[PDB]
C-alpha cells in the first residue's frame, strides 16, 4: 500500500482471475474513482476491465489475440524489431491493458472514465440491512483489525453477530461497544445465556428459482465502445 499503485505493476491493478461478483463487490464503492481487471471465468483467455461507475462497476471484456499473423505463429516479426501485440478492450485496441487504461483516464470509454487501481484498498464490510440480529459467538484468535470499523477482539471474546454476510465473516460487535466484521473461521457460535430466537440465515433453502452460486452469464462482458 501507499506506494503500490500503478498500471504496469500487474499486481495491484490486476486481480487476475477474480470472480465477476468478487471483482465488483470490492471495487464497487471503493472511492470517487477506481478500476480493476478480471479474467472472465467463461473467457479464461480474454481479460476484462472493470470501472466502478454507479451502484455496481462496469465489466468490460478485453481480447488478447496475441501477436500472431493469420494462420502462422510468427514468421515475420523479429526482423523488423518493432513487433506490436494484440489487445483490444471495447472498440479501440492498442498493445496491452495499461496502454488502454491511460487512454480513457479522462476520455470516457463508456460513461465513467478510467481511474486509479482499486487494489486491496482496505476492508469494507458490505453486509445487508433490514433484518433481525443476536449475540452469540466466542472469538478464538488474537486479531488486531484492519481499521477503526472492523471488529478485532482477542481470543475468548463474545461478539454480537449482526448478520452473516459470508462464511468468512459475520458482522459482529465487541463487548466494548464497537462493532464491525469479525473473522468467522476464527470465532464460533456460543450461547452463554442469550440464545435468543430467529436466524435469518435459514430463511430459504435454495429452491429452484434461487439456486446456489448465482445466475450464470456464459457470455461477453460488453464493450466500453458500442455507439460512441
Curated annotation (Swiss-Prot):
Keyword Nucleus among record annotations: no
Modifications after synthesis and translation: Phosphorylated on Tyr-221 upon cell adhesion. Results in the negative regulation of the association with SH2- and SH3-binding partners, possibly by the formation of an intramolecular interaction of phosphorylated Tyr-221 with the SH2 domain. This leads finally to the down-regulation of the Crk signaling pathway. Isoform Crk-II: Phosphorylated by KIT.
One function term, GO molecular function aspect: phosphotyrosine residue binding
Keywords: Acetylation, Cell membrane, Cytoplasm, Membrane, Phosphoprotein, Proto-oncogene, Repeat, SH2 domain, SH3 domain
Domain SH3: 132-192
Domain of life: Eukaryota
Modified sites of kind N-acetylalanine: 2
Compositional bias of kind Pro residues: 67-82
Region (Disordered): 61-85, 201-228
Phosphotyrosine modification, residue list: 108, 221
GO CC field: actin cytoskeleton; cytoplasm; cytosol; extracellular exosome; membrane; neuromuscular junction; nucleus; plasma membrane
Main location as per UniProt: cytoplasm
Chain positions found as Phosphoserine: 40-41, 74, 83, 125
A GO biological-process term: negative regulation of natural killer cell mediated cytotoxicity
SH2 domain residues: 13-118
Function: Involved in cell branching and adhesion mediated by BCAR1-CRK-RAPGEF1 signaling and activation of RAP1.
Family of the protein in this entry: Belongs to the CRK family.
Domains (record comment): The C-terminal SH3 domain function as a negative modulator for transformation and the N-terminal SH3 domain appears to function as a positive regulator for transformation.
Subunit structure and binding partners: Component of a complex comprised of SH2D3C, BCAR1/CAS, and CRK. Within the complex, interacts with SH2D3C (via C-terminus), and BCAR1/CAS. Found in a complex with ABL1, ABL2, CRK and UNC119; leading to the inhibition of CRK phosphorylation by ABL kinases. Interacts with ABL1, C3G, DOCK3, DOCK5, MAP4K1, MAPK8 and SOS via its first SH3 domain. Interacts (via SH2 domain) with BCAR1, CBL, CBLB, PXN, IRS4 and GAB1 upon stimulus-induced tyrosine phosphorylation. Interacts (via SH2 domain) with several tyrosine-phosphorylated growth factor receptors such as EGFR and INSR.
Protein name as annotated: Adapter molecule crk
Protein's organism: Homo sapiens
Lineage: Eukaryota, Metazoa, Chordata, Craniata, Vertebrata
Encoding gene (name): CRK
Part of the intact protein present: 1 to 228 of 304
Amino acid at each position: 500500500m501507499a506506494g503500490n499503485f500503478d498500471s504496469e505493476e500487474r499486481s495491484s491493478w490486476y486481480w487476475g482471475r477474480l470472480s465477476r461478483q468478487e471483482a465488483v463487490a470490492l471495487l464497487q464503492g471503493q472511492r470517487h474513482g477506481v478500476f480493476l481487471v478480471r479474467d472472465s471465468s467463461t473467457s479464461p483467455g480474454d481479460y476484462v476491465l472493470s470501472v466502478s461507475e454507479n451502484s455496481r462497476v462496469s465489466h468490460y471484456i478485453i481480447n488478447s489475440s496475441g501477436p500472431r499473423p493469420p494462420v502462422p505463429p510468427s514468421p515475420a516479426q523479429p526482423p523488423p524489431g518493432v513487433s506490436p501485440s494484440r489487445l483490444r478492450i471495447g472498440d479501440q485496441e492498442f498493445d496491452s491493458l495499461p496502454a488502454l487504461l491511460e487512454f480513457y483516464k479522462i476520455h470516457y470509454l463508456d460513461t465513467t472514465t478510467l481511474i486509479e487501481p482499486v487494489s486491496r484498498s482496505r476492508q469494507g464490510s458490505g453486509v445487508i440491512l433490514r433484518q433481525e440480529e443476536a449475540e452469540y459467538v466466542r472469538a478464538l484468535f488474537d486479531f488486531n483489525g484492519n481499521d477503526e470499523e472492523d471488529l478485532p477482539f482477542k481470543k475468548g471474546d463474545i461478539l454480537r453477530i449482526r448478520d452473516k454476510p459470508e462464511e468468512q465473516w459475520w458482522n459482529a460487535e465487541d463487548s466494548e461497544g464497537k462493532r464491525g466484521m469479525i473473522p468467522v473461521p476464527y470465532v464460533e457460535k456460543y450461547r452463554p445465556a442469550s440464545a435468543s430466537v430467529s436466524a435469518l440465515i435459514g430463511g430459504n433453502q435454495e429452491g429452484s428459482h434461487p439456486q446456489p452460486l448465482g445466475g450464470p452469464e456464459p457470455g461477453p462482458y460488453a464493450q466500453p465502445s458500442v455507439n460512441t
